[PDB]
Design a protein around this ligand. Structure first.
Ligand code: HEM
Ligand SMILES: O=C(Cc1ccccc1Cl)Nc1cc(C(F)(F)F)ccc1-n1ccnc1
Length: 461
């Protein structure tokens, strides 16, 4: 019924099929589909996810208008993605006045001052990582980076969100470690999410059946655990994401007990695989380019002599490490996309955007577009050198998004990732094993993950 919207506005795009739109074009994934449409349609094109029209914009000025300028007025919320249950109070899922209240009451939790107080806690499990890394290195066999980084990210999440101190690699039995290990990213091209994308009318049916997109067993366990910790913390009468929220609940509007639980889980969901996935991507690019690995290891030793422990100020000093992280995020933006919902009829940069249309920014396509990048398929971390760090457009390179709805944990994630990278590199060096796919291929699903898990030879330095 709504498949003729983009034709009447003179907007190019793939011709849609009845009842499906262009979901069949997802056979290569969102990343490949967006890049092909960028080459075959220019700067602005459109497509349909079932009956939902999606407009893709690549003009940096338009991206600025959608994400920053007209964010509060028009482009405020993301598209609904399925039955959420009580998790509708999550900040990433909240909409309109609920989101603005929640972000205002949660912004101080991610301050630079509070982050400097969280560095020592994250540093403790960096030493835990190298201990398990040494045993894996002494074996003489290749090591999958997803598991060692997942154990590290899980350890950081448990100690930052709560007061739980666990070695996940050697103790995969605590209830925190078990349930949280199932908090993986959403494959939006799997049979379930594909079915709800074509059948959005089934989302309310799933909600009334108490069928939540998140595992119900994990959510109920975590909610009860917070209730146990909230009472136990009172009996003990701190640097915790929970404690910072508790210190805000007692002193816009207030924050509810169920809201605090919902935001606590979303932090785990936002950090478990995302941190580990980027860490695996970073180490793979260092192994195949040892010149970058050598210079980064030399820079780490210069700022931190004699294998010194990292500090908040020292992490921000290391420049080449920031270049490695940024360039890897350019090649692999694990979000792959940025989406906003147009809540009203509006014209942006001389273009009419009707209400209800989802506006999408192809982060992966822009990050590998030749117009803004030279040899985009190569791992050249020098693109972000201080002299060359200004030529890049901040709205073509959006790994953490932009505007008031960007990643609220960008500073925490960058510090957590960099703290791990300093410790592992100054003690270990990584070489490509035989099982490593030198031309590593990306998965064809809804996740920006490699086709095969990255395996790399590891040795003591
Ligand atoms: C490597 C790790 C991470 C990456 C690459 C990443 C990237 C992103 C991206 C691309 C967005 C979308 C922003 C946009 O729509 O404009 C986002 C949103 C968000 N992220 Fe992250 N993120 C990471 C980790 C985290 C962590 C660990 C937390 C929590 C402690 C977090 C909290 C959030 C929140 C709350 C939002 C939604 C903000 C809003 O709705 O106002 N992120 N992130
Ligand atoms: O916004 C993203 C985009 C993204 C970012 C990185 C990797 C993959 C992806 Cl797809 N994901 C996300 C979604 C939700 C929810 F509840 F709406 F489903 C909650 C939290 C996050 N999140 C992840 C990282 N930081 C925040």
């Amino acid at each position: 019924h709504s498949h003729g919207l983009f034709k009447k506005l003179g907007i190019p795009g793939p011709t849609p099929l009845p009842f499906l739109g262009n979901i069949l074009s997802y056979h290569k994934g969102f990343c490949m589909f967006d890049m092909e449409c960028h080459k075959k349609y220019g700067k602005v094109w459109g497509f349909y996810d079932g009956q939902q029209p999606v407009l893709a914009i690549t003009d940096p000025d338009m991206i600025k208008t959608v994400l920053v300028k007209e964010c509060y007025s028009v482009f405020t919320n993301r598209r609904p993605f399925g039955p959420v249950g009580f998790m509708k109070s999550a900040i990433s899922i909240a909409e309109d006045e609920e989101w603005k209240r929640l972000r205002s009451l949660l912004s101080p939790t991610f301050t630079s001052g509070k982050l400097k107080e969280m560095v020592p806690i994250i540093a403790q499990y960096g030493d835990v990582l190298v201990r398990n890394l040494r045993r894996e290195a002494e074996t003489g066999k290749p090591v999958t980076l997803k598991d060692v980084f997942g154990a590290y990210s899980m350890d950081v999440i448990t100690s930052t969100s709560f007061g739980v101190n666990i070695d996940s690699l050697n103790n995969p039995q605590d209830p925190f470690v078990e349930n949280t290990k199932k908090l993986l990213r959403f494959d939006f091209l799997d049979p379930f999410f594909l079915s709800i994308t074509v059948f959005p009318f089934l989302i309310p049916i799933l909600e009334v059946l108490n069928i939540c997109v998140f595992p119900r067993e994990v959510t109920n366990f975590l909610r009860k655990s917070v209730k146990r910790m909230k009472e136990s913390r009172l009996e003990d009468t701190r640097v915790d994401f929970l404690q910072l929220m508790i210190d805000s609940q007692n002193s816009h509007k207030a924050l509810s007990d169920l809201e605090l639980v919902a935001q606590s889980i979303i932090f785990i969901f936002a950090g478990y695989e995302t941190t580990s996935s980027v860490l695996s991507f970073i180490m793979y690019e260092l192994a195949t380019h040892p010149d970058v690995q050598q210079k980064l290891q030399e820079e780490i030793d210069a700022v931190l002599p004699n294998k010194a422990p990292p500090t908040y100020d020292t992490v921000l000093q290391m420049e080449y490490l920031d270049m490695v992280v940024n360039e890897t995020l350019r090649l692999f933006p694990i979000a792959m996309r940025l989406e906003r919902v147009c809540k009203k009829d509006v014209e942006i940069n001389g273009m009419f955007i009707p209400k209800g249309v989802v506006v999408m920014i192809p982060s992966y396509a822009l990050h590998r577009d030749p117009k803004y990048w030279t040899e985009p398929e190569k791992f050249l971390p020098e693109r972000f050198s201080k002299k060359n760090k200004d030529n890049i457009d901040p709205y073509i390179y959006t790994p953490f998004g932009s505007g008031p709805r960007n990643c609220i944990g960008m500073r925490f994630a960058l510090m957590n990732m960099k703290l791990a990278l300093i410790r592992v590199l100054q003690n270990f060096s990584f070489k490509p094993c035989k099982e490593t796919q030198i031309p590593l291929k990306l998965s064809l699903g809804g996740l920006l993950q490699p086709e095969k898990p990255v395996v790399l030879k590891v040795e003591s330095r």
